[PDB]
């Protein structure tokens, strides 16, 4: 088998992650077509159709059956490197693969930072509002 951390590089693992994905047979954003685009299904309560690139970590809710997940990926995250991987996985080299994984680990960190930032600006707003009300 393949080291679990490295698993989302696998189209078939990514597919397997779609569990009760609403858009099946007749749709353009089918789990197959979705995994092919690098998404994994990571549903929440308020967001049951939440999908995420395993590589750039962009997150997209609000899918419509006519959406082409590739086109939708170039749109909301053109910078993503997986988008450029022409080759099929096992056609890669370990060298090429490790380059890619390093970039993933970097994008992940980049994403963590980015969230911590929003969390920070959220807390700020609360503090601002409070102080204002307290001065009023």
């Amino acid at each position: 088998t393949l080291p679990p951390a490295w698993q989302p590089f696998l189209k078939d693992h990514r597919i397997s992650t779609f569990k009760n994905w609403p858009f099946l047979e007749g749709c353009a954003c089918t789990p197959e077509r979705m995994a092919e685009a690098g998404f994994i299904h990571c549903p929440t309560e308020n967001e049951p159709d939440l999908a995420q690139c395993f590589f750039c970590f962009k997150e997209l809710e609000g899918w419509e059956p006519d959406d082409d997940p590739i086109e939708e990926h170039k749109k909301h995250s053109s910078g993503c490197a997986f988008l450029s991987v022409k080759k099929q996985f096992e056609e890669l080299t370990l060298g090429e693969f490790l380059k890619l994984d390093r970039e993933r680990a970097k994008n992940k960190i980049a994403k963590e930072t980015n969230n911590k930032k929003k969390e920070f600006e959220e807390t700020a707003k609360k503090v601002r509002r409070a102080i204002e009300q307290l001065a009023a």
């Binding site: 939440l50 999908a51 997150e59 997209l60 809710e61 609000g62 959406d67 939708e72």
Partner: peptide, 6 residues
């Protein structure tokens, strides 16, 4: 689709 919010 949309970029996630909140």
């Amino acid at each position: 689709a949309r970029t996630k919010q909140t």
